[PDB]
Write a protein that binds this DNA or RNA. Structure first.
Lengths: 22, 127, 129, 113, 158, 241, 145
RNA sequence: GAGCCCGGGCUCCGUGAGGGGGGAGAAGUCGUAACAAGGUAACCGUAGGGGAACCUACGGCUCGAUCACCUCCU
RNA sequence: GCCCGAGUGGUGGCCACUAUUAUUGGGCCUAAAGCGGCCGUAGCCGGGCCCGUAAGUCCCUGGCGAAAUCCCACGGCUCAACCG
RNA sequence: AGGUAGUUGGUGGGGUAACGGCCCACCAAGCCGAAGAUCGGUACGGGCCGUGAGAGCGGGAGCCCGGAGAUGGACACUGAGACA
């Protein structure tokens, strides 16, 4: 679980933060 | 003409205070005046809201003097020299409650408000 | 540190009580506690005490009859009007009978019942019943 | 200059006060009286006294600490100093924020907080 | 009894004599006692150790009990015996020993700086000084104009 | 509302007159006159409500134009007349006198006494001040002003007992208030008590200036010199007899 | 010390504590801001009239299936799209498209559609200023336009 | 000395292609992740990698594993 | 058949229940929730013993917090509401 | 989370029914703030009101009391009084 979520949250964050940074 | 009060400036704590009413008649005010040195006397009577007529001097030609016994006169004056407030005023001869002026013999110090009372007399300065 | 030395007296005295030892020892000692035990004895709740004043401290050795149920100090020590007494009457005490809500007063120190008979009040100090 | 002020207090040892003191002119002593402590002397003839009082809260049964600054005009006959009680008169306005004049000073070298 | 400060460990239970007036099987005059004190402060010993040697050699456990009454304003004891003579350090010994030590630390750290623990007691000794300062100011052994710092610690010691 | 308040409501009508409170939506409002508004009583009221002589105000007003009442030994006709306190009011068509006295309670009541006491009206004067022409004058807070006292004080500060010959508009028999004299209390929550003054010792700083008194009962009353009114050395009757 | 400062002058701390900790009641917070009043259209109101854009039927929830009668109505001043649950059996009949339909809530304003219905926050009372429970009974009045 | 206007800046209301997630619907598909040592104990913070569940490294923790083997403790 | 009764019910809001906002009168090992640990500023809170003040605090008096509404009495309207 | 430039104060003066930075000339650099200022939201305020065993919580409706307004916004006369 919290492994999952942390990396899902991180990937969401990055990918989206990539989309914001871009 | 001048509005005020005077509740419409700022708070002593840097708040903005906003007016939450309008004008009140009783609480309006008039503008300052220039009482000139001249040979003629230009007066006007004006009616206050307390219901009392008060004289405004718009010019004058006689002040005149007092000692430390107090023997008054009505005689000629000449140029206003030294006004406390601003030296600009001492050029255009604006009489004030604390003005200083040249009289016939000795300099004399004004000691009355001619913008509500309508009077000009002085007391001699001793060197 | 300590504070409320009284209270740390009282609280022993009660936890002392609840066990059913014979007598107590209270290492820190004072007027407050001294006086309060005095008034306490005056109502009778306790038997006899001796304090020995050591160059360190007063100590009270107190004799336990069995009477006391619960006797506790007040936390912020509230001021209480003589009209508000009845409220503080119903709350803290167990019923109308007991009446040692020990307050501190203009006259000195008293219980609740000794306060009411005079007629005077103030800030609360402790309770006993 | 130097006349009895009443309140059961004595007037300053020296006098030479300007017309914004109740020993001259048309500004006069009247009314209620307080006491408080000098924060600052920095403005000219002007001194901050901040009072401490307690207030009650009915909900919690307890008190609170509140602190009301009051602006006080010091007469040039006497100088205020930090950290001493000062006595205040209730008078008509000097200014936007100055409604008070200092009447009788009890001065002190001591300071807490 | 205890206070586990910067520790979890209960403090020593060392305890005073419950004597309130002094032994008379021990015998010294107000004059003799005063000499003993002055001699020891002349050595370079300090008041705790002065009270220590007097205890171990001359058999007086605390000075207050023996001396007072001889001017019953208060108890007469070592440094109050010293101040009347002018032998007292204007800094209280408490505050002095403290600061004294402190300046020694700094020199170690100077040369050795990779020291957690040694760094961490610098922080633990200053902050006792600070306190000891703070209250004295208000009591008055140290003027209110002072404030504590590591250059104003290296000046008091030298 | 930024002009003058020229109506009064019943609910806004003060209960120191014992008016009826919900009779209508509007009460009779005193005009200015002799004495204070929430210390007075309207002529209308004494007629319509107090003494029943009216049903409608068309009655009362007629009654006051013809002359069933004189106030202060003098005729009236404004049917909005505040009748003063400690006051002389006369019925001339029957020969009645009432004092406008406060009760213990604090409502305004009329207390009936004979015609003889209706020539005298104790004044304690509200202030005393110099005027031009080198005179002083005697004030009151029912307004009534008198001139003459033969230069300077000759008597007391303001706590006076005056004898006013009320039909004659004249002042007679001046008498101070002293530390064994009588006082009637007209203002305060100690009203309707008449007593013997213990002393006049005071703590004057600021507004309060203290005067104590103990009555026949012995109820210690602290009133202002002003709330205190000098009834004299005892002449008119006490309220609640 | 069980939390709180107790002490004469401390109270202010108390006074701010409560308030700080009050805002953990969703309901309280929400009202004191007015989120109840801003979000779930109405502008807060008891009820709202609106024009029946169309009639739609939706499915029931988890253990359930049955065709609930729902309208789509547009509130008129609110100007917001509301899908809605209609009381009664036959009903969907008596409601013509483009009659006025007054709308209310149903079963706590919280958002809670009743157990069966997913969405529906709201209720219908009326068809052309005469209600639905009056139109389930034949006699009482019958509809127009 | 108002309203009024003009040029710019900042903010807010009605409304818009497109875009994010939630509580769901539980008849399609992939896998077996966890819950039994779940069939490689599990979790944990950090880092990389994989379609997914997730795997691995390093450090921690037992809320840890089943006998066995060894060691202590009323 | 039960309730209530010219009412009864629906939606909405507020308060109670909710010691689910803890003053009265809540918790926080594992249920939600202890900061990874310390320091000390502001704050709150403070051992004993004597003396001054009486600021808080209590007691008494006195000025005062309009009427209305509330509570109690008596009186009025047939009764009560309502009013005096 | 820092705000403040008639801005805080001083001297002298104007204007006003009148005190006052109300306004103004000169001089000074204060004034306010974590005991929460400033800014933003929301809101007439009070008597009361609802509820609750109490403590408390919510509320400003008739009515009374005080203030503000009169299509938005400014402006004077006339009068004791209006900026009506």
């Amino acid at each position: 679980m919290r492994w999952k979520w942390i990396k899902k949250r991180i990937r969401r964050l990055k990918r989206q933060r990539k989309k914001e940074r871009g | 003409m001048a509005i005020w009060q005077g509740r419409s400036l700022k708070k002593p704590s840097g708040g903005r205070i906003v007016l939450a009413r309008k004008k009140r008649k009783r609480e309006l005010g008039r503008e300052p005046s220039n009482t000139r040195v001249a040979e003629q006397d230009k007066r006007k009577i004006i009616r206050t809201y307390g219901g009392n007529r008060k004289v405004r001097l718009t010019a004058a030609a006689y002040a005149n003097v007092f000692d430390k016994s107090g023997k008054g006169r009505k005689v000629r004056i000449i140029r206003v020299i030294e006004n406390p407030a601003n030296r600009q005023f001492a050029r255009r001869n604006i009489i004030t409650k604390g003005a200083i002026i040249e009289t016939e013999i000795g300099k004399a110090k004004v000691t009355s408000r001619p913008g509500q009372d309508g009077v000009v007399n002085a007391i001699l300065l001793e060197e | 540190t300590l504070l409320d030395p009284l209270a740390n007296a009282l609280s022993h005295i009660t936890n002392s009580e609840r066990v059913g030892k014979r007598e107590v020892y209270i290492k820190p000692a004072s007027k407050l506690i001294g006086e309060v035990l005095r008034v306490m004895q005056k109502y009778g709740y306790i038997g006899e005490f001796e304090f020995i004043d050591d160059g360190r401290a007063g100590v009270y050795r107190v004799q336990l009859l069995g009477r006391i149920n619960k006797a506790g100090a007040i936390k912020p020590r509230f001021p209480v009007k003589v009209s508000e007494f009845e409220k503080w009457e119903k709350r803290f005490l167990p019923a109308f009978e007991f009446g040692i809500l020990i307050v501190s007063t203009s006259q000195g120190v008293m219980s609740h019942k000794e306060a009411i008979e005079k007629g005077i009040g103030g800030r609360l100090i402790a309770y006993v019943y | 200059m130097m006349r009895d002020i009443g309140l059961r207090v004595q007037p300053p040892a020296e006098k030479c006060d300007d017309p914004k003191c109740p020993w001259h002119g048309n500004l006069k002593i009247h009314g209620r009286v307080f006491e408080g402590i000098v924060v600052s002397d920095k403005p000219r003839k002007t001194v901050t006294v901040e009072r401490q009082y307690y207030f009650y809260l009915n909900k919690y049964e307890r008190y609170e600490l509140r602190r009301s600054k009051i602006h006080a005009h010091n007469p040039p006959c006497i100088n205020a100093k930090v950290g001493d009680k000062v006595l205040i008169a209730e008078t008509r306005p000097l200014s936007k924020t100055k409604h008070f004049v200092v009447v009788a000073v009890l001065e002190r070298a001591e300071e807490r907080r | 009894m205890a206070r586990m400060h910067a520790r979890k460990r209960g403090k020593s239970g060392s305890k005073r004599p419950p004597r309130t007036a002094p032994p008379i099987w021990v015998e010294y005059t107000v004059e003799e006692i005063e000499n003993l004190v002055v001699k020891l402060r002349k050595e370079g010993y300090s008041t705790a150790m002065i009270g220590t040697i007097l205890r171990d050699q001359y058999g007086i456990p605390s000075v207050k009990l023996f001396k007072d009454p001889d001017n019953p304003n208060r108890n007469l004891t070592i440094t109050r015996i010293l101040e009347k003579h002018g032998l007292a350090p204007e800094i209280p010994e408490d505050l002095m020993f403290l600061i004294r030590r402190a300046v020694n630390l700094r020199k170690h750290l100077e040369q050795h700086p990779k020291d957690l623990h040694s760094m961490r007691g610098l922080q633990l000794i200053e902050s006792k000084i600070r306190r000891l300062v703070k209250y004295y100011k208000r009591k008055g052994k140290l003027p209110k104009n002072w404030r504590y710092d590591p250059e104003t610690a290296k000046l008091l010691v030298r | 509302r930024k002009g003058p308040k020229r109506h009064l409501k019943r609910l806004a009508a003060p209960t120191s007159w014992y008016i009826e409170r919900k009779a209508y939506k509007w009460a009779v409002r005193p005009r200015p006159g002799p004495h204070n508004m929430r210390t007075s009583i309207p002529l209308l009221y004494i007629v319509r409500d107090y003494l029943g002589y009216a049903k409608t105000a068309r009655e009362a007003r007629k009654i006051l134009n013809e002359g069933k009442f004189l106030v202060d030994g003098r005729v009236r006709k404004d049917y909005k007349f505040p009748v003063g306190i400690m006051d002389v009011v006369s019925i001339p068509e029957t020969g009645e006198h009432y004092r406008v006295l406060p009760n213990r309670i604090g409502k305004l009541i009329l207390h009936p006494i004979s015609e003889d006491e209706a020539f005298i009206k104790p004044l304690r004067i509200r202030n005393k001040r110099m005027i031009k022409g080198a005179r002083v004058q005697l004030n009151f807070h029912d307004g009534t002003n008198h001139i003459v006292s033969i230069a300077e004080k000759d008597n007391y500060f303001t706590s006076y007992t005056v004898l006013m010959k009320v039909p004659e508009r004249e002042i007679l028999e001046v008498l101070p208030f002293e530390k064994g004299a009588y006082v009637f209390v007209t203002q305060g929550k100690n009203v309707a008590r008449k007593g013997r003054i213990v002393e006049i010792k005071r703590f004057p700083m600021g507004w309060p200036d203290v005067v104590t008194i103990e009555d026949e009962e012995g109820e210690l009353f602290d009133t202002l010199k002003e709330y205190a009114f000098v009834v004299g050395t005892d002449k008119p009757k006490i309220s609640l007899p | 010390g069980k939390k709180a400062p107790n002490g004469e002058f401390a109270g202010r701390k108390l006074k701010l504590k409560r308030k700080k900790f009050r805002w953990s009641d969703i309901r309280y917070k929400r009202r004191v801001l007015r989120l109840k009043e801003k979000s779930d259209p109405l502008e807060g109101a008891p009820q709202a009239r609106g024009i029946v854009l169309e009639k739609i039927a939706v499915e029931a929830k988890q253990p359930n299936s049955g065709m609930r009668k729902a309208v789509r109505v547009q509130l008129i001043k609110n100007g917001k799209v509301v899908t809605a649950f209609c009381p009664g059996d036959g009903a969907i009949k008596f409601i013509d498209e483009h009659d006025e339909v007054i709308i209310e809530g149903i079963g706590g304003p919280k958002g809670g559609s009743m157990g069966d219905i997913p969405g529906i926050r709201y209720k219908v009372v009326k068809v052309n200023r005469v209600s639905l429970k009056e139109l389930v009974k034949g006699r009482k009045e019958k509809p127009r336009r």
